[PDB]
Structure formats: C-alpha cells, structure tokens
Amino acid sequence: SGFRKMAFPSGKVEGCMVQVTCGTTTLNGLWLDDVVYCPRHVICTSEDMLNPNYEDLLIRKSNHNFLVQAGNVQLRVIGHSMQNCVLKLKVDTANPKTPKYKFVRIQPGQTFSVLACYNGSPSGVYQCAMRPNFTIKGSFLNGSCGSVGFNIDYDCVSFCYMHHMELPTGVHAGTDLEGNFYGPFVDRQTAQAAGTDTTITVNVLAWLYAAVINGDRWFLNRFTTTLNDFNLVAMKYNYEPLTQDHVDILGPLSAQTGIAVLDMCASLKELLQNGMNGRTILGSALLEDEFTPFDVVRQCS
Amino acid sequence: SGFRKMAFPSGKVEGCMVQVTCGTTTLNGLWLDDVVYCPRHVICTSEDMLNPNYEDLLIRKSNHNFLVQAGNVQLRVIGHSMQNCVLKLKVDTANPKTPKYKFVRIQPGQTFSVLACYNGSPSGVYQCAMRPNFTIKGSFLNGSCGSVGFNIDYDCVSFCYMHHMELPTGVHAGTDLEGNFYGPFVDRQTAQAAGTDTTITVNVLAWLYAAVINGDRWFLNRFTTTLNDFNLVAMKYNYEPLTQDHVDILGPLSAQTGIAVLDMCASLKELLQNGMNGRTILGSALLEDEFTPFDVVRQCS
C-alpha cells in the first residue's frame, strides 16, 4: 500500500554528470562515451544573449576555451560542434560509467525524473511532467543548466530533457537531448512567456484508479457517460480532451479495478462539478495530474 | 524557483542492494563491506511468526541455508549473526562499491529518502518523514523488506531505516540499521496498530518560509504571538508543540525572509483558524509537514 511521487533510481545518470566551464560561465554537462552534451548558451556573455548569432560566436572559440571536469580529473576537449541549441564537446576520455541509453523527445503529459545538479555534482532527484504548454514546474536555481530529465526502461536510460532557463512565472523551459526546445521557446533574451496551461485528463483518471487500488472509493458513483458528454464538461473546467486512445491506455487499470473508463469519467465529472466536500484522495485535497497510466502500473499492486 | 519533494541522489545506495533468500522467503539486503544486513524475519515461516523465538530459530540454520545474489554473481555466506531485529550475513566478498557511511537512529519529524527494491533491484526513490507515531507513510508492496531509508551529508551516507512490515491502516513500520524498531512495534504476528498521529509543526513553519522565499505571501499578517499562546492553539488543532529549540532551528530561515518566527506562528494560527479560503501555497491546498528546516535550506535560494 501507499502512493508517492516516485522518481527512477538516479545512479546511471549521476555517473555521467560533469561540470562545463567557458570563460566565466559554469553549468553542467552530460558525459556519454567521449562526448559531453550541454546548452549552447554556455559560450555567451549576457550581452551576447540580446541578439545571438551562435554560428558566428562558436567560430570565435577554440577547444582550449572549454573546460570539462569529472570529479577530480579534468578532461581535455579535442573537438566541438553544435546541434540545434546543444553544444557537443568531444573529449579525450570515454566515460567508463556510460549506461545503455537513448535520446527520446516526449509528448506533453508524459512524466520524467529530474536530477538537479550544480557544478557537476547532483544535488537531488524529483518527478515532474511536461505540461500541455511545454514548460515544466521544476525546482531549479542559477547553475542548474545542463541538468537532465529521464525515464528508465529495464536497464536503458531514456534522456528526454536538458534544462536551459526559467520563465517569469517561475516555470522552466528546455530542450530534448538533440537541442530542440519544447514549446515556442528560444535561447535568447526576449519577452517570452508560458501560454495558458490545461490539466492532463488521462493522468487524473489514472490517479483516481490508483486511489481505488489503494482502497478509497467514496468518489465513485452509479453513473456512466459518453466520451462526447464527458469532453463537453472537461473543456468547461480547462481539462485536456480525452481521446479513444487515452481510453485504451486506461484499459489495464480498468480491468484490474472492475470500473469502466466511462464510469470513472462520470466520477471525475461529479468531482469537478461538486468538489471534494472536505475530503481527500491519496492525501491530496486537489486532483493530481502528474502520474501517467504507466506510472500507476509501475508502482501499484 | 520552484519547490518539490526532493530525494537525495540514490546512486551510492543502489550499488549496495542485494537479494537475500532463505528457504522460500526472498527479500532485499544491504551489502556494506563483507556484511549483508537484512530483517531477521527472513528465517521465519508464516507459522513461526505467531510466537517466534529467533535465538532458537537461528541456531537451527546453517550458512548454506542463506543465498545472497548481487546482480549476476552469487555471494557465499561464510558467517551469520543477529543484532536485535536484523540479521548480519558475513560474505566471502567485500563490496567494491561501498560508500563512506554511518548508521544513525533518527528522531520523529526527521525526513529521509527511500530506495524501494524488489529482488535486489531498485524500483524507485521517494521522500518521507518519520511520523510522530513512529510509522512512515511510504509506498511498499510484498517483497520490499530490506529496502532502506537514508540521508546524504557531503559524500557520507547515513542509513536510518530498514523496512519490515505494513500495519492495517496502510502505514509502514521498520527498524534503524542496528535492528531497533521505531515505535512500539515487534516482528511477530500480533494485533498491533499505529497510535494517534500529530502534525509536525516546525516542518509546517519551514514550508511556509519556503513559500515566502518563492514569492507567495498572501498568508502573512501584522500580528505576533507568544510561544505559549501559539502552543495553546497548536494543541487544539492536533499539532506538535513548538519548543524554543525549534525556534532557534528556524533562525536562518527567519533571517533570510525578515519574518520573525513568532510572526510566522501568528500566520499559521490564522491559517488553522480560518483555513485557506480557496487558495493554495506552493501548489498545495493542505498545509505540508514533510520538509524540515534543513530540507528548505538545501533546496531554496
């Protein structure tokens, strides 16, 4: 029993974290084989950020302008290249602790574990989701750039996020491991803001199933709904639309509890219309949307 | 910016997790040097749990009755002893990945990271506190016995918990790494239940300071209180008493925000009397008590 925000074990990622230095900027890098991956804004001054031409800036740099530090040892940079918004520093030593890995670009609504680092040393690990507006509600301070988001499948690490910036609302923006930003964000100092966010509906339904698995079913009812009628109420409460694909993804959780997806949708509809009336679900007074149907399966009985 | 439930990086602990087998029971063990630590109930059948005499049960066992498996390799048990409610299996190989470590017995209200394991393999990591009633609100399934709780100070791992059982309310009970249970719990099948729990007051105050550090201050007021008058209201709402020592521990957070501890106590008093009036604090509709003043300092600006 129990249900907690659960991150993947961070060991395979810790052995990859290095510190990257360029001039007066210090951030983190991800050391995999003989290549160190990091945000390309490491080469910029604050003045360069106003209207940067990175191709023109990188041509002014040499290999000796980059400093890589792994624990105590200093790695020599023997090459450098840019791919989108990430810099790839070729080093003279291949990382002996490189795990089996993949670079994957995730969809909005998907979750991942974050290993927050400062100066090449991991500080902590936590779980979060890619919000529908393509920002993340993380916990990041100055120097956290280069920290990564990931999931673990068997023994393979799937890196899905690299941290780059904090927006004015306190939310965070970054790229996949190939340097493509999630959302309409760019790596330059411009007026950029997060768009309106919505609640991840398939995730709320998965978390209500986890609550049933853990023994709390006060919120259930005898009603059912159509996919269309539920979607009419979802749009009203700023919820993401539920597709037939989401219903299929929720199938294994529906078969374990005995509650049809459309029956669970009628409980969610009543919870949104009537509130909780002073009651909690898995220790929460608010509906939770940062657990995917896969996360519930992995942690539950 | 941001504030999340943050666990310590779990790498140093993952390299210690092994699978222990005795007869038909399989649980996890903690491999440190040439000793494997695990719950002593691994030697018992379900029938033995009714009224066990462990000294008499352990004398019937040989070294070959114990099976230790670290990844692919099988470790030979060359000795065995019991210390309180933990079994210590001496093995022929010292763990090459043993970190710098300590065994520490924590006070109620203190937090730690849990690395949940099944069959010697870590499944995930999450944060929790030792509740005032000496149980933990964890997330554990069958086979999780031997999973450990810990904190990390610089490069030293402080192990504070080993998992043993789940009580009827779904909460969890276990020992320190020297085999002494937290609370009045025993490792036998008897009617045992968690006592009444209370809210960890110094932790709620620390989390309100974290909210001020992150920019939300709607809950502040112009009032102050005495330590005695605040304690009169705390007892009424089932909160732990606040001592002068707790006030001193909250000093660095009080000096960073400019808000006196007794001023923060008057905000908490009003929050308990009037509620939140449809408002949240750090994304939470309930007051949070599983962040110590040290946890806030470690993660905040």
> Can you give chain A as a three-state secondary structure string?
CCCCCCECCCHHHHCCEEEEEECCEEEEEEEECCEEEEEHHHHCCCCCCCCCCHHHHHCCCCHHHEEEEECCEEECEEEEEEECCEEEEEECCCCCCCCEEEECCCCCCCEEEEEEEECCEEEEEEEEECCCCCCECCCCCCCCCCCEEEEEECCEEEEEEEEEEECCCCCEEEECCCCCECCCCCCCCCCCCCCCCCECHHHHHHHHHHHHHCCCCCCCCCCCCCHHHHHHHHHHCCECCCCHHHHHHCHHHHHHHCCCHHHHHHHHHHHHHHCCCCCCECCECCCCCCCCHHHHHHHCC
Angle of CA points B11, A289, B280, to nearest 5°:
100
Q: How many CB atoms lie within 10 A of CB B94?
A: 11
Does A11-91 match A201-299 in CATH topology?
no
> Is the Cβ of A118 closer than 8 Å to some Cβ of chain B?
no
Number of residues in chain B:
301
Which one, of B242, B237, B211, B238, lies nearest residue B226 by Cα? Answer: B242
A60 contact partners, CB below 8 Å, separation of at least 6: none
Q: Strands A17-22, A66-70: parallel, antiparallel or unpaired by DSSP?
A: antiparallel
**To probe the interface with A, which of B3, B4, B113, B155 has the most A CB atoms within 10 Å?**
B4
B246-278 burial, b at 16+ Cβ within 10 Å, e below that, comes to bbebbeebbeebebebbbbbbbbbbbbeeeeee
Left (φ > 0), alpha (ψ -120 to 50) or beta: where does B181 sit? Answer: beta
Contact A299, A214 (CB under 8 A): no
CATH of B11-91, one of 1.20.120.420, 3.40.50.10320, 2.40.10.10, 3.30.1330.10: 2.40.10.10
**Rounded-to-10 torsion of CA A170, A171, A176, A177:** 30
Which residues from A are below 8 Å from B214, CB to CB? 170
Task: Find the radius of gyration of the CA atoms of chain B.
Answer: 22
Which residues from B are below 8 Å from A6, CB to CB? 116, 124-126, 139
CA distance A15 to chain B (A): 8
Q: Return the residues preceding each gap in chain A, C–N over 2.5 A, or none.
A: none
State how far the Cα of B130 lies from the Cα of B152, in Å rounded to an integer: 17
Task: Find the radius of gyration of the CA atoms of chain A.
Answer: 22
Angle of CA points B250, B253, B255, to nearest 5°:
105
State how far the Cα of A18 lies from the Cα of B246, in Å rounded to an integer: 38
State how far the Cα of B260 lies from the Cα of A300, in Å rounded to an integer: 43
Nearest residue in A to B141, CA atom: A1
B130 contact partners, CB below 8 Å, separation of at least 6: B106, B107, B108, B109, B110, B111, B112, B136, B161, B182
Q: How many CB atoms lie within 10 A of CB A286?
A: 13
A157 contact partners, CB below 8 Å, separation of at least 6: A12, A13, A99, A100, A101, A102, A150, A151
Residue in this structure with the two tokens 């009037």, named with its chain if needed? B274
Nearest to B7 among A15, A124, A166 (CB): A124
Binary contact (A126, B11; C-beta < 8 A): no
Q: Strands B156-166, B148-153: parallel, antiparallel or unpaired by DSSP?
A: antiparallel
> Is the Cβ of B275 closer than 8 Å to some Cβ of chain A?
no
Left (φ > 0), alpha (ψ -120 to 50) or beta: where does A189 sit? Answer: beta
**To probe the interface with A, which of B6, B28, B118, B290 has the most A CB atoms within 10 Å?**
B6
Q: Which helix (H) or strand (E) holds B293?
A: helix B293-299
Which one, of B149, B199, B154, lies nearest residue B174 by Cα? Answer: B149
Angstrom distances, CA of residue B284 to CA of A283, A287, B5, B125, B199: 11, 11, 12, 21, 16
Catalytic residue (choose from A16, A38, A41, A160): A41
Retrieve residue B93's tokens. Answer: 């190989």
State how far the Cα of B2 lies from the Cα of A136, in Å rounded to an integer: 10
Name the phi and psi angles at B139, rounded to 5. -135, 95
Angstrom distances, CA of residue A171 to CA of B2, B153, B168, B186: 8, 29, 40, 46
Binary contact (B10, A9; C-beta < 8 A): yes
Q: In what order do the strands lie in the sheet with B66-70?
A: B73-75, B66-70, B17-22, B25-32, B35-39, B86-91, B77-83
Q: Strands A25-32, A35-39: parallel, antiparallel or unpaired by DSSP?
A: antiparallel
Q: Strands B35-39, A100-103: parallel, antiparallel or unpaired by DSSP?
A: unpaired
CATH of B201-299, one of 3.30.565.10, 1.10.1060.10, 3.40.190.10, 1.10.1840.10: 1.10.1840.10
Collapsing DSSP to helix, strand or coil, B65 comes out as helix
Contact B177, B263 (CB under 8 A): no
Name the phi and psi angles at A269, rounded to 5. -55, -45
B121 contact partners, CB below 8 Å, separation of at least 6: B17, B19
> Is the Cβ of B71 closer than 8 Å to some Cβ of chain A?
no
Sign of the CA dihedral running A256, A258, A263, A268: negative
**Rounded-to-10 torsion of CA A138, B287, B239, A281:** -100
CA–chain centroid gap for B138, Å, is: 8
State how far the Cα of A204 lies from the Cα of B145, in Å rounded to an integer: 30
